[PDB]
Amino acid sequence: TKEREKAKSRGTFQKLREKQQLEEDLRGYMSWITQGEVM
Amino acid sequence: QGPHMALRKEAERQALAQLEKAKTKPVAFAVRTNVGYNPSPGDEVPVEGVAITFEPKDFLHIKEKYNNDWWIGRLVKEGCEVGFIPSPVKLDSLRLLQEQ
Amino acid sequence: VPPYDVVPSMRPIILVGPSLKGYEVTDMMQKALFDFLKHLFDGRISITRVTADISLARSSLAEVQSEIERIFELARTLQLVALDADTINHPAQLSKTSLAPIIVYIKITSPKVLQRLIKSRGKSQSKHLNVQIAASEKLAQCPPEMFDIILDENQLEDACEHLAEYLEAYWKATHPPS
């Protein structure tokens, strides 16, 4: 637990937050084109 | 008195039947408001109590025209009924009455 | 200064400017957003395609006013109006006419992902990198309260939950019960 605080305090929190939210925004931006590829 | 209540009380019930028979009429034209206005007791309202108020940048679906000083229409809001919309010449008459 | 302005009885729904229109990006990301507008209010909506610039009251005054009065006809039967515009890219662009449309804003929550949509549409859109997000950052220089509907939900069922429930709450406000 003392090491997850020292991985909070280097930089590592955003890596599983940004790339998480860069993925769910990637999957959501695909539907805004591909639901108009059909109709 | 007794001679003044024979025509004043007969005009409130005549204007209430016109207001009740205009809710089923379709919307003729809508207006976009720019200023704020609230109903008061000395605004020469035909049916005292069935008047509506509007703030700036509000929408009014006017049903019909009652007279040259009051319109009939409703407010764009969930649950609101028809009401008395002041005409633009009534809004010009209410402003010059505050100076005189 | 006139206190009252002649507006239509039903406001037209305008899916305007997440990124700048006139590309494969914004048009076909708005073209998808008339697919859910196609059958959801079917029978109580009027879907049309806007060609002329209605922000002039280019095209003359006769060709634009004939399309403005066409919107005036669609508000007579008390039904919803949808506009597929390809030139509208600001709220203040449609603030001088007598229509007052619903500024539905498709919101782009992160500008860093927007340049990766440019790289995903091939090399055709890659020559329009910084100019698109420029006034789509002036669509961030707009205050968000200047719009009417803002869509920042990424998924389809989450972005259409705001698209359907806000117009249903607007439908009950314009039509009172018997």
UniProtKB/Swiss-Prot annotation, chain A:
The gene is CACNA1S. Pore-forming, alpha-1S subunit of the voltage-gated calcium channel that gives rise to L-type calcium currents in skeletal muscle. Calcium channels containing the alpha-1S subunit play an important role in excitation-contraction coupling in skeletal muscle via their interaction with RYR1, which triggers Ca(2+) release from the sarcplasmic reticulum and ultimately results in muscle contraction. Long-lasting (L-type) calcium channels belong to the 'high-voltage activated' (HVA) group. It is found in: Cell membrane, Sarcolemma, T-tubule. The lineage of its organism: Eukaryota, Metazoa, Chordata, Craniata, Vertebrata. Each of the four internal repeats contains five hydrophobic transmembrane segments (S1, S2, S3, S5, S6) and one positively charged transmembrane segment (S4). S4 segments probably represent the voltage-sensor and are characterized by a series of positively charged amino acids at every third position. It comes from Oryctolagus cuniculus (Rabbit). It comes from the Eukaryota. Belongs to the calcium channel alpha-1 subunit (TC 1.A.1.11) family. CACNA1S subfamily. Component of a calcium channel complex consisting of a pore-forming alpha subunit (CACNA1S) and the ancillary subunits CACNB1 or CACNB2, CACNG1 and CACNA2D1. The channel complex contains alpha, beta, gamma and delta subunits in a 1:1:1:1 ratio, i.e. it contains either CACNB1 or CACNB2. CACNA1S channel activity is modulated by the auxiliary subunits (CACNB1 or CACNB2, CACNG1 and CACNA2D1). Interacts with DYSF and JSRP1. Interacts with RYR1. Interacts with STAC, STAC2 and STAC3 (via their SH3 domains). Interaction with STAC3 promotes expression at the cell membrane. Residues 20-37 are annotated as: Binding to the beta subunit. This is Voltage-dependent L-type calcium channel subunit alpha-1S. Phosphorylated. Phosphorylation by PKA activates the calcium channel. Both the minor and major forms are phosphorylated in vitro by PKA. Detected in skeletal muscle T-tubules (at protein level).
Swiss-Prot record, chain B:
It is found in: Cell membrane, Sarcolemma; Cell membrane. The N-terminus is blocked. Disulfide bonds: none annotated. Coiled coil: none annotated. Residues 26-95 form the SH3 domain. It comes from the Eukaryota. Regulatory subunit of L-type calcium channels that consist of a pore-forming alpha subunit and auxiliary beta, gamma and delta subunits. Interacts with CACNA1A, CACNA1B, CACNA1C and CACNA1S. Component of a calcium channel complex consisting of a pore-forming alpha subunit (CACNA1S) and the ancillary subunits CACNB1 or CACNB2, CACNG1 and CACNA2D1. Identified in a complex with CACNA1C. Identified in a complex with the L-type calcium channel subunits CACNA1C, CACNA2D1, CACNB1 and one of the gamma subunits (CACNG4, CACNG6, CACNG7, or CACNG8). Belongs to the calcium channel beta subunit family. Regulatory subunit of L-type calcium channels. Regulates the activity of L-type calcium channels that contain CACNA1A as pore-forming subunit. Regulates the activity of L-type calcium channels that contain CACNA1C as pore-forming subunit and increases the presence of the channel complex at the cell membrane. Required for functional expression L-type calcium channels that contain CACNA1D as pore-forming subunit. Regulates the activity of L-type calcium channels that contain CACNA1B as pore-forming subunit. This is Voltage-dependent L-type calcium channel subunit beta-1. It comes from Oryctolagus cuniculus (Rabbit). The gene is CACNB1.
